[PDB]
Amino acid sequence: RVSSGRDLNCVPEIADTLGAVAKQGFDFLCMPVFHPRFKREFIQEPAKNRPGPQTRSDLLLSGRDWNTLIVGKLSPWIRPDSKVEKIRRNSEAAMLQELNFGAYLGLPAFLLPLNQEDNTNLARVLTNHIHTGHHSSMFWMRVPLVAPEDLRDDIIENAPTTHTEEYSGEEKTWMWWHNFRTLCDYSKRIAVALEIGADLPSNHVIDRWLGEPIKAAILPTSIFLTNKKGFPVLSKMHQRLIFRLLKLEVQFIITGTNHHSEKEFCSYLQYLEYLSQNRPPPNAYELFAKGYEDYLQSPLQPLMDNLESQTYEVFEKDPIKYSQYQQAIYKCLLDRVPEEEKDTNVQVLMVLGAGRGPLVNASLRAAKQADRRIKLYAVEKNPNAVVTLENWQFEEWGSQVTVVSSDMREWVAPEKADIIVSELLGSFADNELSPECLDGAQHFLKDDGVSIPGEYTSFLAPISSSKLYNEVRACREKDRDPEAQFEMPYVVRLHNFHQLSAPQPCFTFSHPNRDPMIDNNRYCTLEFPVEVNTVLHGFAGYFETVLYQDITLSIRPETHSPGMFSWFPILFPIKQPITVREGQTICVRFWRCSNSKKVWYEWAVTAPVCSAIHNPTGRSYTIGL
Amino acid sequence: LPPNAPACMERQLEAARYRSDGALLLGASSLSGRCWAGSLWLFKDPCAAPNEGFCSAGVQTEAGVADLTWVGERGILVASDSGAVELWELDENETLIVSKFCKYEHDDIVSTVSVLSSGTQAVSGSKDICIKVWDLAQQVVLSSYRAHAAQVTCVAASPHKDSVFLSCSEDNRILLWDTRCPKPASQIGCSAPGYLPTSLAWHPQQSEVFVFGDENGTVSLVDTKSTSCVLSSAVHSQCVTGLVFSPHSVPFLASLSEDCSLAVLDSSLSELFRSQAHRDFVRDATWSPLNHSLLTTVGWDHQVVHHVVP
Numbered sequence A: 001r002v003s004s005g006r007d008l009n010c011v012p013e014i015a016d017t018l019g020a021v022a023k024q025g026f027d028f029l030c031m032p033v034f035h036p037r038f039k040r041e042f043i044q045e046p047a048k049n050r051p052g053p054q055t056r057s058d059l060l061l062s063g064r065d066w067n068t069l070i071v072g073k074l075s076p077w078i079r080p081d082s083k084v085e086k087i088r089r090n091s092e093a094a095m096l097q098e099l100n101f102g103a104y105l106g107l108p109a110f111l112l113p114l115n116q117e118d119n120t121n122l123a124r125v126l127t128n129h130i131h132t133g134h135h136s137s138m139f140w141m142r143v144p145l146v147a148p149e150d151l152r153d154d155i156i157e158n159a160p161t162t163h164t165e166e167y168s169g170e171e172k173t174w175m176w177w178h179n180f181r182t183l184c185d186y187s188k189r190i191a192v193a194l195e196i197g198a199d200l201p202s203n204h205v206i207d208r209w210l211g212e213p214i215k216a217a218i219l220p221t222s223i224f225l226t227n228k229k230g231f232p233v234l235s236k237m238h239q240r241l242i243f244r245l246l247k248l249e250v251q252f253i254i255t256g257t258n259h260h261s262e263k264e265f266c267s268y269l270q271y272l273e274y275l276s277q278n279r280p281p282p283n284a285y286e287l288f289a290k291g292y293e294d295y296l297q298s299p300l301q302p303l304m305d306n307l308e309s310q311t312y313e314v315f316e317k318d319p320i321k322y323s324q325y326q327q328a329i330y331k332c333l334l335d336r337v338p339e340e341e342k343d344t345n346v347q348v349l350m351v352l353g354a355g356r357g358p359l360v361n362a363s364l365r366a367a368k369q370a371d372r373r374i375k376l377y378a379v380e381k382n383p384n385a386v387v388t389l390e391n392w393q394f395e396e397w398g399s400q401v402t403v404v405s406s407d408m409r410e411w412v413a414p415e416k417a418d419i420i421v422s423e424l425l426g427s428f429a430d431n432e433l434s435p436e437c438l439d440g441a442q443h444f445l446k447d448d449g450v451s452i453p454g455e456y457t458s459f460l461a462p463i464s465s466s467k468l469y470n471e472v473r474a475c476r477e478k479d480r481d482p483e484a485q486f487e488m489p490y491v492v493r494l495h496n497f498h499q500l501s502a503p504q505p506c507f508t509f510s511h512p513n514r515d516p517m518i519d520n521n522r523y524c525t526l527e528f529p530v531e532v533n534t535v536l537h538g539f540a541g542y543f544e545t546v547l548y549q550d551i552t553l554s555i556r557p558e559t560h561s562p563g564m565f566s567w568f569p570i571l572f573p574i575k576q577p578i579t580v581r582e583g584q585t586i587c588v589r590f591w592r593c594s595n596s597k598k599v600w601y602e603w604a605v606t607a608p609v610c611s612a613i614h615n616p617t618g619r620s621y622t623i624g625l
Numbered sequence B: 001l002p003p004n005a006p007a008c009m010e011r012q013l014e015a016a017r018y019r020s021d022g023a024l025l026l027g028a029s030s031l032s033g034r035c036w037a038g039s040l041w042l043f044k045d046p047c048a049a050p051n052e053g054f055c056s057a058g059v060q061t062e063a064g065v066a067d068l069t070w071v072g073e074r075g076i077l078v079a080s081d082s083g084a085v086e087l088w089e090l091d092e093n094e095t096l097i098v099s100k101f102c103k104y105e106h107d108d109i110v111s112t113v114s115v116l117s118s119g120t121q122a123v124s125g126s127k128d129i130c131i132k133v134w135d136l137a138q139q140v141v142l143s144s145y146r147a148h149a150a151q152v153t154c155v156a157a158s159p160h161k162d163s164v165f166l167s168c169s170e171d172n173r174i175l176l177w178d179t180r181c182p183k184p185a186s187q188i189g190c191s192a193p194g195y196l197p198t199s200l201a202w203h204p205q206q207s208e209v210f211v212f213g214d215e216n217g218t219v220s221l222v223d224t225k226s227t228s229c230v231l232s233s234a235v236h237s238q239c240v241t242g243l244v245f246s247p248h249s250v251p252f253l254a255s256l257s258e259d260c261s262l263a264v265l266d267s268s269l270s271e272l273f274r275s276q277a278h279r280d281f282v283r284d285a286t287w288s289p290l291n292h293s294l295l296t297t298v299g300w301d302h303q304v305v306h307h308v309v310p
């Protein structure tokens, strides 16, 4: 269903209040840990020597309750950036005190406001609390989509509201967030409590928050409409945002008094649940992409490494891609054996990297479908997978299939091939070294032979995700370069991100490769027009391949093959995030580089600013030949 | 101790308001410890206060009392931490205090209340940034104004004009309101943006002059007409929480700060008197109707102090 809490700034009895909100179906309570009005003096006598207690006792709840049900709140008088020095000092002292109490209590989260532009000293104090013990507890920064000054009623005769359009200005609240998090050096403990108003801003303003670490959405009772039966409800545009936010799995917080007085506060929560269960449904693929959202993975290197049984099992788990392969071979067979020559003509079909035989089985289904005759070679360098193959061939395929336990670049074949078939492609196409492997094998392909696939193309797109930037940054390891995390690609179901530009083709390969001298090295320059203010954090990679003629496979979103959504895209990080102003072009440069020993990518951004070249001479990342 | 009157007054004394007859209205909050609530007390003998046993009447409020005001002689209008504005009514015998109405219209703590010149209307101000106008008899909100862009600190009704009230906020705005204008609010302030405005008091006789205190302890006298920042004194080492005019023909002005001090100032803003009596925050002042030279201060030190002013 939905994870939801109640926001209160009045708790007479913490016991009854918590009990009440439980009966109303709230998972947790946001409340002050000190009385919001109880302003404290730390430096000046006599109020400094105010007898205590300074707040209510930890003993009033279980450690478990404090740990799970309670989100603390900074008292609203606390103004660390106050221009008034005595207020600044008392607010520094009080903020430390209240944060130290939430740590004392074991609170899972604590709410702090970003309610103006300058929160420098507030960030400096929070950073201090974070750098005082390693603790897990989250800090939810309460920021509004729309600054209060731009929300205010136009009811001041001599202070009219500026009704003029303001692209940058309407985005001021994100800049408040950006500056705070940047000062606190992207602490994983600091996330966004996004506060929504009755008036949503422009879609550009909402888009600003796409890649940001949103843990909580705050819905005032104010923003809720009333149906005929007098139930609380939301505008379709509000409802669209909820459906957007459910995808990011945020916790919803209900703030304000009951305005639908006939009905209980169950009413507001009832509505959210109603939206949850009745949400535009996803797909099996989104169920396939189940728990992998923004989960960073090492790209598989099935050449340099021998894949495990369950790796092959997952490759086999999506039948559709093999049905595509079956179809490409079927078509190629009919184009090569006239119906007159069906029984005289038996084609030599070689599966190059046969794994546990899915392409072998697809090749066989294709031949019986075409009613045409094939001899099969199953070539596989992974001797563990040869075990699976040789049991299959003994038990089922028989002597039609000759299993070969060899690297296709070393193998001396007894005869030349009509058709070579392979699945040597990664999420960035050539990133498993299909080029080098098939190049080594082509000397044993007939002069009129077909490679399936005949072609593949990598695509790139610039993306924004402060979330994934932090994920990568967090992948530092001992005994290597402290920044090697950023100079290697990751396979990942990119989820909390913004794609800043349409994907552009990067590198393309063709098989057979007729070039008299063959260079699989590449240098490509891409220009991505960007129509929004944003921060570049890296580049999403995808691929398309032509198996045969019109039969293709793609993970490129615009051309995505059906059923192949368990096959995730790739991410090329950059070390330093890059600010991009609307109307600017992002220019990225990519190299595919090689030795006898290793193939690697190097990459740089040249616009709107220059990055360092990432992964120079494969220092951080190579692919084994 | 009376019937319906609690054994123990909450420690944090928020409000002190003398009625015409000289009876004392007390508001108190529990701002620490287990239970965070408040209380309303009537002391027909003001010198007994704060002692609960020697009280004419007392009641417990669900939540703390941020602000208070007399509504005529038997009415008490309350700013609650709960976001409710509540109307409490005195008994015929005035031996107990009964809730007339409690309306939860504010989304956050109700910080400030004032009764307008009619006595049938009040203005509320809240940390929720809204200012509301109340039909006291029908117990509803006539108007709700989001003029400000931060928490509303003070709202003070005009002495004699039922459409006019001041407001101040941490948006650094002093707003002059007139509900007769389709754009009711008007920003009033000295040439330089200065320290946040904290406290407000209309001149009792001069319907177009008011005074405001700031978070830096400066007290300022303002003429709507001249719209010039006429006079300012550095009266306090900290925030000016409250400003109260004497009942005198030429009024004296009581100044109360978080510096835990009270000062009394002439119309020229010069300082006649100073009391260090309180050892915590000074929350309110009411001059005795009976003896105009007598002034009662209340503080979070739970002290009810009676001052004789020279």
Ligand SMILES: CSC[C@H]1O[C@@H](n2cnc3c(N)ncnc32)[C@H](O)[C@@H]1O
Residues within 6 Å of the ligand: A302, A303, A306, A307, A315, A352, A353, A354, A355, A356, A379, A380, A381, A382, A385, A406, A407, A408, A409, A423, A424, A437
């Ligand atoms: C089915 S995933 C790709 C398969 O091709 C195999 N493979 C990759 N490169 C080569 C090569 N050069 N020679 C033989 N098999 C290969 C891998 O072991 C893997 O099972």
